[PDB]
Design a protein around this ligand. Structure first.
Ligand SMILES: [Zn+2]
Lengths: 131, 89, 51, 119, 112
RNA sequence: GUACCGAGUGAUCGGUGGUGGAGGUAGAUGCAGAGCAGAUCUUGGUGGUAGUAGCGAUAAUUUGUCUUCAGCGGCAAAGACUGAGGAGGAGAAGGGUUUCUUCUCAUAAGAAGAGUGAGCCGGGUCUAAGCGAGUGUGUAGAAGCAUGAGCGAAGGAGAAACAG
RNA sequence: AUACCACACACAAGGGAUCGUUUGGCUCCUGGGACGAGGAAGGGCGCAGCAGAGAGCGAUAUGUGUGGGAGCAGCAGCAAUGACCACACGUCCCCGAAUACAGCAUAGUGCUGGAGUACUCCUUGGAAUUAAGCAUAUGAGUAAAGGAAGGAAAAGAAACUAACGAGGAUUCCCGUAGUAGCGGCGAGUGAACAGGGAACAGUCCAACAGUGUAAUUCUCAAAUGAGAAGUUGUCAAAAGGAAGAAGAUGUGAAUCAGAAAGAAAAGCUGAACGAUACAGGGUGAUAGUCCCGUAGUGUCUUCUUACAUACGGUGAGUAGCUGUGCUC
């Protein structure tokens, strides 16, 4: 049960809040679980998927496959994974997008600011965990 | 006759664009606008509630009024270079 | 006619720049849902009231 | 070349005015390479950012020049005080609101009370 | 006195105040000129009549245009004519005190 | 939703086979914006009449030839007509790109470009009949009345250009 | 009836009912009640690499600073030398109260004007309608038109009720009451005190200011002087505080596998695990354990509020009266 009356439980309101999200709230939509080993290598339980990271598909047509993330579509919430595609009548191949939550991370791309992003989150935990 | 043949003579134009309201209703001979009463200081009485709500505050852009509300929320902080003047006052 | 005031001329200039179809590249954009520009006009079918 | 704010803040008003004529000359040259010939889409963006930065840094330096002048004076020019709104500028100060005596109580003040219980 | 001003040629009316800070350089040569026009229509005018054609800011007048050219490009000017076009652009035509110099200035400036 | 078949005096109810692609009832009670053939009813969609009634006042049209791809479209040669108070050549009021080039039929249709240069031409000046801010008096506020800055003619007055 | 006209059934046309769905509406409750001469509200015109409308912004038309951090939806180009977002600031074209103006106050600085007006206060003031007709009356001191202010506004501490063994400012709720009465005594209209509660608070001016000296307010100087207002009368004292409330934001448990079948399992079947969290939303069919939250817990920022002097019993074109008009 919910006892805070400032938070809404309306279906109409929850749905609008989802689809009209922007900025950091949009980034929260692209989160995926880490594998059991990585959850010992790092403190975090889940992270936003980025290009170059390595993922196992755990639901759908392409179940059991593994591959590298090629692109991240923020407007239509989908991820393109290397080697997951369909062939047209022409023989031409189109990558099919997968929803973030159907993936699981196997190796992290550590290019750019990723190491600082991870550090910032670990500290935020401990700050309140140790109190 | 009063129908089609009299329509041919209708080539003069009594109203032009008003400079206060835009509404092509300034009568040149009378020296008055039929939408907004220019050049009188106050705006005209609008005929009914339906017609007046079409020209109220919030039907356009409200540029100044919006900024004022944001500044009031922030506590009227002013330009940060000049904080010392603010603080003294 | 040939004699015009400055106020009448600016109204004609603005009424002439607005009278154009949707550019052909916009139709390819993922989020774009318009078919035809409903604000297009013809001199044979409407008056500007520039007077 | 993309000018940076912290690396301009070191110049005098006399030096910054020199820089402005160059940026404006460069903008003219850009417009010609658009009517005539062909332009990379990035060029007009970069041209226009450079003028805006110089005008922003000049304005700050002139405000400081005015601050040093009037800081300690009576009759500060209005523009140096924050705008607020017309009614907040005309309000009475909190001292002035409390000097009046026009219907104030004799007894029944906050000061005439004791800390007591009831049983 | 208040009047609707529908027959007037100047759309501005109000007299302008002073200000505590004033804008750095003011209405000045590099605001006045926009670009020179180089196409088959303009090319003939350089070759036959020693005149260049330019787009200029709406706020500009004959005297200002004369000064701005002599400042940016450097040749001396005989005449300036002006034309408000149906596309909302003010065009200026500038004739130089010596012909032949028109082809020199046009080529240096990359108009032609 | 659509064909069949069964149950009920009847309002209605049940099953079977194709179509459809994600929700739905049976019993007992509660609240109602709770059942249509009609109102010269309201809104939207479709017939018969019917390949029918009509589409042709005015000067009039023929032949060859090229395109067009099937335009009495263009060009040559004939035959006519308006007949200088013209079906000719120009301005104003009104319209506003309808003007020029290219392409396409989508055609009294579109799309993309280009085009209007003044000391001497007209406006910005003067004043007609007249209108009027402010001030005075009046009114709950107005209207009205006295005086009066400013305004009032692209065909009245009004410095100076013509050929190629 | 060979071929026309009608009806039934199957297939193809023609139209958009029905069923399934919804980032919209409506109603009730709670907060808020924030404009303008420092140029508003409202109108116009410009600004994109390819850009008509709409959105955003002013010739600085995606600038500066802080907190974050990954892409910019098409095509070409950009981006850890910061893509994009959030908070504040800087810049902010022309018309418009539109003002180089009008009226007005001070020793001086100045103030007003226009916008909005659901709710509150002050004026002015109908007719349709009901009376089974209609003229007094009704609808109604309502509609319409004008003036003015605030987050509420108005009212308010008895020249008050009552006749009890009396009460004790104003406003609001239950009630006296469809009563006492008003009325072609027709149609119809119509209050007050009590008794039970919410919330509670009282005070100022004049009459009436030290005369062994206006002791009072303001300006410039100066470290103690000049000047303005005022004798048609100026001047009657305290800092000070912790509480109370509203927002913003951090953290936050626990799952795997399978026959058949499907485009896809979260369904179904077996085995587990969390709960101070089984509110609700998203994921390719119906998910406590896949994602965002929720229960529980931390931080921070704003706002509101608080001690001093002297007094009484005569406030006039008023109360009242005569005539007159409206009103209850
Ligand atoms: Zn108007």
């Amino acid at each position: 049960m919910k006892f805070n009356k400032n938070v809404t439980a309306s279906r109409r309101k929850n749905r609008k809040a989802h689809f009209t999200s922007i900025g950091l709230e949009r980034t929260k939509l692209m989160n995926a679980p880490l594998s059991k080993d990585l959850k010992e290598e790092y403190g975090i339980k889940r992270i936003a998927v980025r290009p170059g990271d390595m993922v196992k598909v755990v639901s759908g047509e392409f179940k059991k496959k593994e591959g590298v993330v090629m692109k991240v579509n923020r407007h239509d919430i989908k991820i393109e994974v290397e080697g997951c595609f369909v062939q047209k009548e022409d023989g031409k191949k189109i990558n099919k997008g997968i929803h973030p939550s159907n993936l699981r991370i196997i190796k992290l791309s550590m290019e750019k600011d990723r190491a600082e992003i991870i550090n910032k989150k670990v500290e935020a935990m401990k700050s309140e965990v140790k109190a | 006759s009063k129908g089609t043949p009299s329509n041919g003579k209708k080539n003069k134009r009594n109203h032009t664009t008003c400079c206060r309201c835009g509404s092509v209703s300034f009568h040149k001979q009378k020296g008055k606008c039929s939408s907004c009463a220019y050049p009188e200081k106050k705006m005209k009485k609008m005929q009914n509630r339906k017609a007046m709500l079409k020209k109220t505050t919030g039907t356009g852009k409200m540029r100044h009024m919006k900024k004022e509300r944001i500044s009031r929320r922030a506590g009227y902080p002013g330009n940060p270079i000049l904080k010392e003047i603010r603080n003294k006052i | 006619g040939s004699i015009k005031t400055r106020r009448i001329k600016v109204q004609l200039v603005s009424a002439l720049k607005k009278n154009r179809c949707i550019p052909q590249w916009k139709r390819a954009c993922p989020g774009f849902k318009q078919q035809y520009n409903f604000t297009k006009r013809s001199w044979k079918r409407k008056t500007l009231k520039a007077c | 070349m993309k000018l940076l704010a912290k690396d301009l803040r070191n110049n005098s008003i006399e030096e910054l005015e020199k820089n402005l004529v160059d940026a404006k000359s460069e903008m003219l040259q850009i417009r010609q390479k658009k009517q005539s010939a062909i332009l990379k889409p990035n060029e007009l963006r970069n041209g226009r950012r450079n003028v805006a930065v110089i005008l922003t840094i000049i304005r700050e330096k002139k405000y400081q020049q005015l601050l040093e002048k009037y800081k300690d004076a009576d009759n500060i020019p209005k523009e140096l005080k924050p705008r607020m709104n017309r009614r907040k500028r005309q309000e009475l100060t909190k001292k002035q609101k409390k000097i009046s005596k026009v219907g104030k109580t004799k007894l029944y003040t906050k000061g005439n009370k004791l800390i007591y219980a009831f049983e | 006195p208040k009047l609707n001003r529908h027959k007037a040629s100047r759309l501005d009316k109000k007299i302008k105040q002073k200000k505590l800070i004033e804008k750095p350089l003011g209405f000045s040569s590099l605001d006045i000129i926009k670009y020179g026009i180089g196409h088959e229509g303009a090319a003939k005018l350089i070759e036959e009549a020693g005149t260049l054609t330019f787009v200029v800011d709406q706020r500009a007048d004959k005297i200002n245009v004369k000064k701005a050219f002599e400042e940016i490009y450097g040749e001396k000017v005989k005449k300036v004519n002006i034309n408000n076009t149906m596309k909302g652009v003010k065009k200026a035509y500038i004739r130089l005190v010596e012909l032949g110099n028109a082809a020199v200035v046009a080529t240096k400036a990359g108009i032609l």
